Design a protein around this ligand. Structure first.
Ligand SMILES: Nc1ncnc2c1ncn2[C@@H]1O[C@H](CSCC[C@H](N)C(=O)O)[C@@H](O)[C@H]1O
Ligand SMILES: O=c1[nH]cnc2c(O)cc(-c3ccc(F)cc3)c(Cl)c12
Ligand SMILES: [Mg+2]
Length: 214
C-alpha cells in the first residue's frame, strides 16, 4: 500500500544509520539508483548545493518543494548552529514523509515544514513566521512557479542584497522564463552550474542568482 515516497522512507528506516544524515542521503541515493527513480536533487547536483551552503553560510534558508526531505536533509546537515531551514510543501503526504526523514536523520530541530502552496505561504512569511529577510532560497517545486514565486519573494520584501537563489532543473525539464528573468535583470548576478539530472546521465544544471536589490 506504500506510495513511492513511503517505499523510500521504508528503505531508509531499515538501512540507514539512525541520527546519521549522510547515511540517510546515501540510502536514498542507493534506492533511486538500484530500485526505483525519484526526483530528489541527487548526489551530483547535491555537491553543488553543498558548496553553495558552505560558501554563503545562510542563517535562514527557504526551500520550495520538500518531497521526501532529501534536499532538506542535505542542507540542514550543513547549517551552522542557530541557523534554520523552512521548507514549503503543497502535498501533505510528502510533508509527512519529509518530517519522518528529518526525524530519522536527527535534523528535526533545524527544520520547519510549512504546509501549502508556495504562492499562498510566501505572503505569510513575515507575519506568521517572524521572517525578516531570507539568506537563501532553493527553488525545486514546479517549473511554472519559478518566475512568479521569485517576483512574489521580491514583492513581499523577503530578498535582500546578497540573497542567493538556487534553482534546480533550469535545463531539464527547463525553466526558460525564470532564466530569461534572472539573466536579463540588473537585480541579479548569475552563475550557471552544469551537472547531471539526478541518477541519470542526462545533462541538467542549477542556476545561482544573487539578488542585488534595487
Ligand atoms: N506550488 C508549490 N508549492 C509547494 N510545493 C509544491 C508546489 N508545486 C509542487 N510542489 C511540491 O514540490 C515537490 C517537488 S520535488 C522536490 C524535491 C526536493 N527538493 C529534493 O531534492 O529532495 C513535490 O513534492 C511537490 O508536491
Ligand atoms: O517536477 C519536478 N519538481 C522538482 N524537481 C524535479 C526534478 O528534479 C526532475 C524532474 C524530472 C526531470 C526529467 C524527467 F524525465 C522526469 C522528471 C521533475 Cl518533473 C521535477
Ligand atoms: Mg528538481
Amino acid at each position: 500500500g506504500d506510495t513511492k515516497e513511503q517505499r523510500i522512507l521504508r528503505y531508509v528506516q531499515q538501512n540507514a544509520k539512525p541520527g546519521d544524515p549522510q547515511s540517510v542521503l546515501e540510502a536514498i541515493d542507493t534506492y533511486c539508483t538500484q530500485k526505483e527513480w525519484a526526483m530528489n536533487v541527487g548526489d551530483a547536483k547535491g555537491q553543488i548545493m553543498d558548496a553553495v551552503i558552505r560558501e554563503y553560510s545562510p542563517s535562514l534558508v527557504l526551500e520550495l518543494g520538500a518531497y521526501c526531505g532529501y534536499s532538506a536533509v542535505r542542507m540542514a546537515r550543513l547549517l551552522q548552529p542557530g541557523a534554520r531551514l523552512l521548507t514549503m510543501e503543497i502535498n501533505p503526504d510528502c510533508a509527512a514523509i519529509t518530517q519522518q526523514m528529518l526525524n530519522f536523520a536527527g535534523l528535526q530541530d533545524k527544520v520547519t515544514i510549512l504546509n501549502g502552496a508556495s504562492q499562498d505561504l510566501i505572503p505569510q512569511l513575515k507575519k506568521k513566521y517572524d521572517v525578516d529577510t531570507l539568506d537563501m532560497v532553493f527553488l525545486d517545486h514546479w517549473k511554472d512557479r519559478y518566475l512568479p514565486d521569485t517576483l512574489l519573494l521580491e514583492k513581499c520584501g523577503l530578498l535582500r542584497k546578497g540573497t542567493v537563489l538556487l534553482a534546480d532543473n533550469v535545463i531539464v525539464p527547463g525553466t526558460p522564463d525564470f532564466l530569461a528573468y534572472v539573466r536579463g535583470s540588473s537585480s541579479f548576478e548569475c552563475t550557471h552550474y552544469s551537472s547531471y539530472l539526478e541518477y541519470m546521465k542526462v545533462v541538467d544544471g542549477l542556476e545561482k542568482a544573487i539578488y542585488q536589490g534595487p
